[PDB]
Amino acid sequence: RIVNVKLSLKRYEYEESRNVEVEIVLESGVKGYGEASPSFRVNGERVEALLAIENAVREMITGIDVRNYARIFEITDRLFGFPSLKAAVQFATLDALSQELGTQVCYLLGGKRDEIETDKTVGIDTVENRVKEAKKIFEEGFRVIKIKVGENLKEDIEAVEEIAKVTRGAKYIVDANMGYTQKEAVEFARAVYQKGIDIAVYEQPVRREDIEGLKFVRFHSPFPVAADESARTKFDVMRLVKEEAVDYVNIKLMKSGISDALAIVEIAESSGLKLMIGCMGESSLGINQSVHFALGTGAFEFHDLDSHLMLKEEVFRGKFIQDGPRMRVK
Template sequence: MSHSADVAPTPERAIVSVGVLTASLPLAQSFQHASSGLIDRLEEVVVKVGLADGTVGWGEVRGNAPYVTGETQSRIVAALSDVHAPAVVATRPTTPTALNRLLAGLAMGNSSARAAVSIAAEDAWARQAGLPLQAMLGAGDVKTVRVHGTIPFCAPDEAARRAERYLDIGIRRIKQRVGLSFEEDVARMRAIGDVLKNHPAGPEAEIAADANQAWNAKEALRRIATFERLGLAFLEQPVRAADIRGLKEVRDGAGIPIIADESVGTPGTLMQVIEAGAADGFHFKLVKAGGPRQLMGMVAIAEAAGLGYMMGQMDEGQLATAAALHCAAASNPFSCELWGFQRVGSQPFSGLEFVDGTIRLPDGPGLGITIDEDGLTPVAHFGTPFA
């Protein structure tokens, strides 16, 4: 797999302005998993980047997901306003390499803040070039990305209804949340399994699960024995993110693939998990990696190790989803959890379309997403005024 090099730096490519904005997106369906608590709205942070020629790009990250990144909306806004945005407009980077080198040296951690700036800049540079972001990342002209569906904690009959609906609209992999009550986990899994047995598309479909760090290794292995008998295709993140030894213990003792998510936030932690032989595959996300180029670097590491990976995201708006979709289009994930806007009741972003189990990437350059600025709350601005 090839990834494109930087376009030659020219003055019109310089980043001359950065805006920091927020959005509160109400959810039509609240959700929770083993480490999140109840979530009924998405507290987003949005970055607007302006280039010297007037081209504008946008980036979005989830602010209320500290259980994954350690960051909150206020912390991301503070990092952007106090550190990242002033440094970017003072330095005026003209290429992704220059920008990411700058961001990496500014403040330890803060992956969501770095991702927001990186996504916005990549959007601007791709718009300026008249190309979709996937082309800037080395892809061809991928039109659609197949996605899988997720089922939250709910009653078994509700899980069955959601599974049937997913199968009806073309989704063939269904991943359920587990980790709060094992008995209820099993009941939901059996209900979903019954749907697969009776649905015409059932033979093509499979069930997976995500424990979101719910157990220790011994608890996970006891539960996996039951899940295996129920036909589970894979289990994601059974133990705490930092428990690499426990993750390896589970992987060594399980009869199904174990996928690492929170344990592989950066290229460095990915290398640790690979060297430990602690996972069969990985779940990559922009907010953990720190931006599109870092995420594509993690893709290259996984591919070099001969291990599979999923492309995913937090529940986010269409702007953040589009960024992850372009990364998926430029790589070869075995599955994509990129329907993170499905539960949002209303949002100031548009351009994505669901078609028969896939998300259609929007036409047009950059991320291809339309932004309604009236739905955003300005927080800070640095550099020259936007054109």
């Protein structure tokens, strides 16, 4: 049984990310840990707001045995306004449970895979700095490169071409972050396509509420279209599946929590949907949540878990092994 719950502000400098770490302590002395990396843009969350409800969170789950984690999951699903916190508390519960069970979270989730590979992101910058970053990334061993676009169609097309030139042999994931209209999103795909470049996953090119737009882009795009911001809850995904809107759903524990993340996996594998997993601004201890999730369920074609690689940490705090673009368990 949980005896106490603690939330703590943890700041990480890039190369700042304000997260909230969750610590759950059991009667047995075991301690579980999770990390909430909130998003105002995606979830409408504010870190100060997450910190203000520490007592309510404590009260919601204190006294519940982690062996009845499904009860903790149902209760924390009520924190739909604080999804990143939902994620952290649910994972910390499993982290604690897997310790009392003498195993790891990934195995608790099925231990499907022993290794996964993450991409690294080439953010928005001048075409020059972009390509320069792509080369650096490619050099470090990354063979899946995430390219951010969305605010300048013509320049975005040019950037992808230039990046492809200096990274032949790698696959590309393009995230337009809701910056394009339907017609622009289609034009982006076609232009890239005519240059002989292939995009493994074309992420959320239109507005989050524009489900028909996603469907429209999916139909004309020669590349697989993914929903990210349009896919926060299991209910959003069921709607996406019913409207036959996308080829992929990009799961983020920060949007869905563990509970919804698990449902989305089942729904996807039951409807021909492909999956990729992403992140927000998690540090090593937070990315750990996604690593175990991706390793145990083994449900993802691609993994975009590089946020911890953009932060400075005195010491590694994840319960996994980071080896180049690869992650494994021990």
